């Protein structure tokens, strides 16, 4: 519980930088653009999460189905173990059943 | 997002301020002070 004895430097963050000014600018690209591109294409990140949502088990299954063949050995083994554990916990464990 | 408690000092002090006149380790140790303070109240 020993708290620091000196005030930290004040983080001088600007709310009018390039990212904070351009954030979410093209979210209505379809609505205002004679529909040609969904807001899905604007999602930047992993290949298996570009415009998708799910729980941990579904995410793991989807990741294994798309990029499972390009994974490393240890991460693939960990993914298989995690898939098995999530399956068992979600189907055989719980209170509401 | 790792979240940790920073006001634990004040959380402990809010209980320890009512046990400063006790005898023994009850006035210093927090584990022994909460029980003593509750019985005092």
């Amino acid at each position: 519980f020993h708290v620091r004895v000196t005030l930290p430097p004040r983080k001088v963050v600007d709310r009018w930088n390039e990212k904070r000014a351009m954030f979410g600018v093209y979210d209505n690209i379809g609505i205002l653009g004679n529909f040609e591109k969904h807001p899905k294409e604007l999602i930047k990140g992993p290949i298996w999460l570009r415009g998708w949502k799910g729980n941990e088990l579904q995410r793991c299954i989807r990741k294994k189905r798309m990029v499972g063949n390009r994974m490393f050995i240890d991460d693939l083994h960990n993914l298989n173990k995690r898939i098995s554990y999530l399956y068992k916990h979600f189907n055989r464990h719980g209170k509401y059943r | 997002l790792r979240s940790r408690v920073t006001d634990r000092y004040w959380r402990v002090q809010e209980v320890l301020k009512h046990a400063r006149h006790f005898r023994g380790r009850k006035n210093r140790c927090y584990r022994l002070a909460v029980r003593a303070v509750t019985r005092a109240f």
């Binding site: 708290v3 620091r4 004895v5 000196t6 005030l7 930290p8 004040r10 | 940790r4 920073t6 006001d7």
Partner: peptide, 26 residues
């Protein structure tokens, strides 16, 4: 290293209080 300013500023208040208790001003 705990990320926060409220705890540091509150401890600065407490440090000022302890300084006041130790050396009282005229």
């Amino acid at each position: 290293a705990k990320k926060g300013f409220r705890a540091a500023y509150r401890f600065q208040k407490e440090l000022e209080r302890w300084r006041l208790l130790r050396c009282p001003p005229p």
